[PDB]
Amino acid sequence: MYVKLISSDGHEFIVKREHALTSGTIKAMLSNEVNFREIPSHVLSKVCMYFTYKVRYTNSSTEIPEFPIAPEIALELLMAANFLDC
Amino acid sequence: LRSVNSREPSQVIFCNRSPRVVLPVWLNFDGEPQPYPTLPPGTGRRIHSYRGHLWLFRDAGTHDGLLVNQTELFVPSLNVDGQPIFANITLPVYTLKERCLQVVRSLVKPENYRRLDIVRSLYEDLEDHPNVQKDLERLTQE
Amino acid sequence: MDVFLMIRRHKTTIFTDAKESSTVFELKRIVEGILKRPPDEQRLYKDDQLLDDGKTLGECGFTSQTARPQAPATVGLAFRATFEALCIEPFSSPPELPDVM
């Protein structure tokens, strides 16, 4: 029902399994817990939010909002999004 | 993959439910893309077009893809007893990667773009600007 | 009406949603289910302000303007019962922008 993702810096983001399955990389990483030796906190929190975002807005008339990304975070996120395929 | 030659008027309307300056793109009889004047974010516009015609919509400044009535291909259908067909233009749920390119592409001049530290395969992706011609071929193979 | 939360204490963060009308105490049940510590051993906050079991998340600040999937609002967790002080470790700093505006 829930899983845990652990950032390179210790922090634990506990999230729904389907939300996490969004990322194929993650899926494969269970089948529990995923440690992510390469993704800092300011980056995995945004990922999880993205899962929430995707999961809610996929298959939906109700006008969709911009997913937002602060500048400083963009590179790191792009690298994470790419490792994780999402 | 072309607009059908009419010749039956169709009252259409483009609501821009998006947060970008939308660019209507009409698909000629030959299959070429015709740009129409842009639609700012909240706004809308009454258009005459024709049953059978092909329209798509992109971010006018960076050509990112947008949905109309939840697909990419808008076919002005029969108007009859009812007046305008509605053309709701929305963001899709972009992949987080695509989403990332988007900011990134827009915070650095691709002129200046070599000098940022990241895998080079990543650097090709950023160079790989989304494109009507592209998606036009992409949206062709179905 | 779904509200979208980040339930945080220490280095732990839960992402969940809940109804604008569910109860604070109902959130602790939720937590229970996950960090397995019962509602009486957890205390929940919005920004320091100490939240009441009987009140609704809406009534508590959590409304769809505020707690959106892509920007979930934060709920302080604190444990035990003597109760520990509320302490949320901040997230890592991004490195400074390269030569871009």
Coordinates of C-alpha atoms in Angstrom, one line a residue:
Chain A
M1 CA 0.0 0.0 0.0
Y2 CA 2.8 2.4 1.0
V3 CA 6.5 2.3 0.1
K4 CA 9.5 4.4 1.2
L5 CA 12.0 6.2 -0.9
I6 CA 15.2 7.3 0.7
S7 CA 17.0 10.3 -0.5
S8 CA 20.8 10.6 -0.9
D9 CA 20.6 12.7 2.2
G10 CA 18.7 10.4 4.6
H11 CA 15.1 11.7 4.3
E12 CA 12.3 9.3 3.9
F13 CA 9.4 9.9 1.6
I14 CA 6.7 7.3 2.3
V15 CA 4.3 7.1 -0.5
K16 CA 1.5 5.0 -2.1
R17 CA 2.8 2.0 -4.1
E18 CA 0.7 2.9 -7.2
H19 CA 1.9 6.5 -7.1
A20 CA 5.5 5.2 -7.0
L21 CA 4.9 2.7 -9.7
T22 CA 4.5 5.7 -12.0
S23 CA 8.3 5.4 -12.5
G24 CA 9.4 2.2 -14.2
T25 CA 12.8 2.5 -12.7
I26 CA 11.3 2.4 -9.2
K27 CA 8.8 -0.3 -10.2
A28 CA 11.7 -2.6 -11.1
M29 CA 13.4 -1.5 -7.9
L30 CA 10.7 -3.3 -5.8
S31 CA 9.8 -6.7 -7.1
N32 CA 9.4 -2.3 0.8
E33 CA 12.1 0.4 0.3
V34 CA 14.2 2.1 -2.3
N35 CA 17.4 3.8 -1.3
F36 CA 18.4 6.4 -3.9
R37 CA 22.1 7.1 -3.3
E38 CA 22.0 9.7 -6.1
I39 CA 19.0 12.0 -5.6
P40 CA 19.0 14.7 -2.8
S41 CA 15.8 15.7 -0.8
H42 CA 15.0 18.9 -2.7
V43 CA 14.6 16.6 -5.7
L44 CA 12.7 13.5 -4.4
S45 CA 10.1 15.5 -2.8
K46 CA 9.3 17.1 -6.1
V47 CA 9.3 13.7 -7.8
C48 CA 6.7 12.5 -5.2
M49 CA 4.6 15.5 -5.8
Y50 CA 4.9 14.8 -9.5
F51 CA 3.5 11.3 -8.9
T52 CA 0.6 12.8 -7.0
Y53 CA 0.1 15.2 -9.8
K54 CA 0.3 12.7 -12.6
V55 CA -2.0 10.3 -10.8
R56 CA -4.7 12.9 -10.1
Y57 CA -4.7 14.6 -13.5
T58 CA -4.3 11.7 -15.9
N59 CA -7.6 11.0 -17.7
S60 CA -9.2 14.4 -17.0
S61 CA -11.3 17.2 -18.6
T62 CA -11.2 19.4 -15.4
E63 CA -8.5 21.8 -16.8
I64 CA -5.0 20.8 -15.9
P65 CA -2.4 23.1 -14.1
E66 CA 1.2 23.7 -14.8
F67 CA 3.4 21.4 -12.9
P68 CA 5.9 24.0 -11.4
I69 CA 9.7 23.8 -11.2
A70 CA 11.9 26.4 -9.6
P71 CA 14.9 27.2 -11.7
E72 CA 17.6 26.0 -9.1
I73 CA 16.1 22.6 -9.1
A74 CA 15.6 22.0 -12.8
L75 CA 18.9 20.4 -13.7
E76 CA 18.9 18.0 -10.8
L77 CA 15.3 17.2 -11.5
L78 CA 15.9 16.6 -15.2
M79 CA 18.6 14.2 -14.2
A80 CA 16.4 12.4 -11.7
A81 CA 13.3 12.3 -14.2
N82 CA 15.6 10.7 -16.7
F83 CA 17.2 8.1 -14.4
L84 CA 13.7 7.2 -13.3
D85 CA 12.0 7.5 -16.7
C86 CA 9.1 9.5 -15.6
Chain B
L1 CA -2.7 13.1 -43.2
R2 CA -4.6 16.2 -44.6
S3 CA -7.7 18.5 -44.1
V4 CA -10.7 17.3 -46.3
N5 CA -11.8 19.9 -48.9
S6 CA -15.0 21.1 -47.3
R7 CA -17.0 22.5 -48.6
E8 CA -19.3 22.9 -45.6
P9 CA -18.8 25.7 -43.1
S10 CA -18.2 24.8 -39.4
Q11 CA -18.5 27.3 -36.7
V12 CA -15.7 26.4 -34.2
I13 CA -14.5 27.8 -31.0
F14 CA -11.1 27.7 -29.5
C15 CA -11.2 28.2 -25.7
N16 CA -7.6 28.4 -24.4
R17 CA -7.9 26.6 -21.0
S18 CA -4.1 26.6 -20.8
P19 CA -1.5 28.8 -19.3
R20 CA 0.4 29.4 -22.6
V21 CA 0.1 31.7 -25.6
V22 CA -1.6 29.0 -27.8
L23 CA -0.9 28.8 -31.6
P24 CA -3.7 27.3 -33.7
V25 CA -2.2 25.1 -36.5
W26 CA -4.5 24.2 -39.5
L27 CA -3.7 21.3 -41.8
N28 CA -3.8 22.3 -45.4
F29 CA -5.3 20.1 -48.2
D30 CA -1.7 19.0 -49.1
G31 CA -0.9 18.3 -45.5
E32 CA 1.2 21.4 -44.7
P33 CA 0.9 23.2 -41.4
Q34 CA -0.8 26.7 -41.5
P35 CA -0.2 28.9 -38.5
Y36 CA -3.2 31.1 -37.4
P37 CA -3.0 34.2 -35.1
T38 CA -2.3 33.3 -31.4
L39 CA -4.7 33.1 -28.5
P40 CA -3.5 34.5 -25.2
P41 CA -4.0 32.2 -22.0
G42 CA -7.4 32.9 -20.7
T43 CA -8.9 34.0 -24.0
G44 CA -11.1 32.5 -26.7
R45 CA -12.1 33.1 -30.3
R46 CA -14.9 32.3 -32.6
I47 CA -13.7 30.7 -35.9
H48 CA -15.2 29.5 -39.1
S49 CA -13.8 26.4 -40.5
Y50 CA -15.3 23.4 -42.2
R51 CA -16.5 19.9 -41.5
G52 CA -13.5 17.5 -42.1
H53 CA -10.7 20.0 -41.5
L54 CA -7.7 19.2 -39.4
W55 CA -6.4 21.5 -36.6
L56 CA -3.8 21.1 -33.9
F57 CA -2.4 23.5 -31.2
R58 CA 0.9 24.1 -29.7
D59 CA 2.6 26.5 -27.3
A60 CA 3.1 29.5 -29.7
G61 CA 6.6 30.3 -28.4
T62 CA 8.2 26.9 -27.8
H63 CA 5.9 24.6 -29.8
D64 CA 5.2 22.4 -26.8
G65 CA 2.2 20.0 -27.5
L66 CA -1.3 20.8 -26.2
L67 CA -4.5 18.8 -26.2
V68 CA -7.8 19.8 -27.7
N69 CA -10.9 17.9 -26.4
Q70 CA -8.4 15.6 -24.8
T71 CA -6.8 14.4 -28.0
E72 CA -4.3 16.1 -30.4
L73 CA -6.4 16.0 -33.6
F74 CA -9.3 18.4 -33.7
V75 CA -11.8 17.7 -36.6
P76 CA -14.4 20.5 -36.9
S77 CA -17.5 18.2 -37.0
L78 CA -21.0 19.0 -38.2
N79 CA -22.4 22.2 -36.6
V80 CA -26.1 21.6 -37.2
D81 CA -28.9 22.5 -34.8
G82 CA -26.6 23.7 -32.1
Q83 CA -24.1 26.2 -33.3
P84 CA -20.3 26.3 -32.3
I85 CA -18.3 23.2 -31.8
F86 CA -16.1 23.6 -28.8
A87 CA -12.2 23.4 -29.0
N88 CA -10.9 23.2 -25.4
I89 CA -7.2 23.6 -25.4
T90 CA -5.3 22.2 -22.3
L91 CA -1.9 21.2 -21.0
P92 CA -1.3 17.5 -21.1
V93 CA 0.2 15.7 -18.2
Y94 CA 3.8 16.0 -19.6
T95 CA 6.3 13.4 -18.5
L96 CA 8.4 15.0 -15.7
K97 CA 11.4 14.7 -18.1
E98 CA 9.7 16.6 -20.9
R99 CA 8.5 19.0 -18.3
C100 CA 12.1 19.4 -17.2
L101 CA 13.5 20.1 -20.7
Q102 CA 10.9 22.8 -21.0
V103 CA 12.0 25.0 -18.1
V104 CA 15.5 24.2 -18.9
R105 CA 15.4 25.0 -22.6
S106 CA 13.8 28.3 -21.5
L107 CA 16.3 29.4 -18.9
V108 CA 19.4 28.9 -21.1
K109 CA 20.0 30.1 -24.7
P110 CA 20.8 26.9 -26.7
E111 CA 23.7 29.1 -28.0
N112 CA 25.0 29.0 -24.4
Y113 CA 23.7 25.4 -24.0
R114 CA 26.9 23.2 -24.3
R115 CA 28.3 24.6 -21.1
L116 CA 26.0 22.8 -18.5
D117 CA 27.0 19.6 -16.7
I118 CA 24.9 16.6 -17.3
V119 CA 25.1 13.5 -19.5
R120 CA 25.4 14.4 -23.2
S121 CA 22.5 12.1 -24.2
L122 CA 20.6 14.6 -22.0
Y123 CA 22.1 17.4 -24.1
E124 CA 20.7 15.9 -27.3
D125 CA 17.2 15.8 -25.8
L126 CA 17.3 19.5 -25.0
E127 CA 18.5 20.3 -28.5
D128 CA 15.6 18.2 -29.7
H129 CA 13.0 21.0 -29.7
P130 CA 9.5 19.7 -30.2
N131 CA 8.2 20.5 -33.7
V132 CA 5.0 20.4 -35.8
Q133 CA 6.9 18.8 -38.7
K134 CA 8.2 16.2 -36.2
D135 CA 4.9 15.5 -34.5
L136 CA 3.3 15.7 -37.9
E137 CA 5.5 12.7 -38.9
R138 CA 5.1 11.2 -35.5
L139 CA 1.3 11.6 -35.6
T140 CA 1.6 10.1 -39.1
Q141 CA 2.7 6.5 -38.4
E142 CA -0.5 5.5 -36.5
Chain C
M1 CA -13.1 17.5 -2.0
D2 CA -9.6 15.9 -1.8
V3 CA -6.9 17.7 0.1
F4 CA -3.2 16.8 -0.6
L5 CA -0.8 16.6 2.3
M6 CA 2.8 16.2 3.3
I7 CA 2.8 14.6 6.8
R8 CA 6.2 15.5 8.2
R9 CA 8.2 14.8 11.4
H10 CA 12.0 14.7 11.6
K11 CA 13.2 13.0 8.4
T12 CA 10.0 11.3 7.8
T13 CA 7.5 12.6 5.2
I14 CA 4.1 10.9 4.3
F15 CA 2.3 12.0 1.0
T16 CA -1.3 11.4 1.3
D17 CA -4.5 13.0 0.3
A18 CA -7.7 13.1 2.5
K19 CA -11.1 14.7 2.3
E20 CA -11.4 18.4 3.2
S21 CA -14.0 17.2 5.9
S22 CA -12.2 14.3 7.4
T23 CA -11.1 14.8 11.0
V24 CA -7.8 15.6 12.4
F25 CA -8.2 12.5 14.5
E26 CA -8.9 10.6 11.3
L27 CA -5.5 11.8 10.0
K28 CA -3.8 10.2 13.0
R29 CA -5.6 6.9 12.2
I30 CA -4.1 7.2 8.8
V31 CA -0.7 7.8 10.3
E32 CA -1.2 5.0 12.8
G33 CA -1.7 2.7 9.8
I34 CA 1.8 3.7 8.5
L35 CA 4.2 4.7 11.2
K36 CA 2.2 2.3 13.5
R37 CA 2.0 4.5 16.6
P38 CA -1.6 5.1 17.9
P39 CA -3.4 8.5 17.7
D40 CA -2.8 9.3 21.4
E41 CA 1.0 9.2 20.8
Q42 CA 0.9 11.7 18.1
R43 CA 0.1 15.3 18.0
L44 CA -0.5 17.1 14.7
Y45 CA 0.4 20.8 13.7
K46 CA -0.1 23.4 11.1
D47 CA 2.8 25.8 11.3
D48 CA 3.4 25.3 15.1
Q49 CA -0.3 25.8 15.9
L50 CA -1.5 22.7 17.6
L51 CA -4.3 20.9 15.9
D52 CA -7.5 19.4 17.6
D53 CA -8.8 15.9 17.0
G54 CA -12.4 16.9 16.4
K55 CA -11.8 19.6 13.8
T56 CA -11.9 19.2 9.9
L57 CA -8.9 19.5 7.7
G58 CA -10.8 22.3 5.9
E59 CA -11.5 24.0 9.2
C60 CA -7.9 23.5 9.9
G61 CA -6.6 25.3 6.9
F62 CA -6.5 22.4 4.4
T63 CA -8.6 23.5 1.4
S64 CA -8.1 22.8 -2.2
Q65 CA -6.7 26.3 -2.7
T66 CA -4.0 25.4 -0.2
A67 CA -3.2 21.7 -0.5
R68 CA -2.9 20.9 -4.2
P69 CA -1.5 17.6 -5.5
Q70 CA 1.5 19.4 -7.1
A71 CA 1.9 21.7 -4.1
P72 CA 0.8 19.6 -1.0
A73 CA 0.5 21.4 2.2
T74 CA 2.5 20.4 5.2
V75 CA 1.3 18.8 8.5
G76 CA 3.7 18.7 11.5
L77 CA 3.8 15.3 13.3
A78 CA 5.2 15.0 16.8
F79 CA 5.3 11.8 18.9
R80 CA 5.0 10.1 22.4
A81 CA 2.3 9.8 25.4
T82 CA 5.9 13.1 27.5
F83 CA 5.7 14.7 23.9
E84 CA 8.8 15.6 22.1
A85 CA 9.0 19.1 20.6
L86 CA 8.0 19.5 17.0
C87 CA 11.2 19.3 14.8
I88 CA 11.1 19.1 10.9
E89 CA 14.5 18.7 9.3
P90 CA 14.5 21.0 6.2
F91 CA 15.3 19.7 2.8
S92 CA 18.6 19.8 1.1
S93 CA 19.8 23.1 -0.6
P94 CA 20.0 23.3 -4.3
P95 CA 23.4 24.4 -5.6
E96 CA 23.5 28.0 -7.0
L97 CA 22.3 28.8 -10.5
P98 CA 25.1 28.3 -13.1
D99 CA 25.1 31.4 -15.2
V100 CA 21.5 31.7 -16.3
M101 CA 18.6 34.3 -16.1

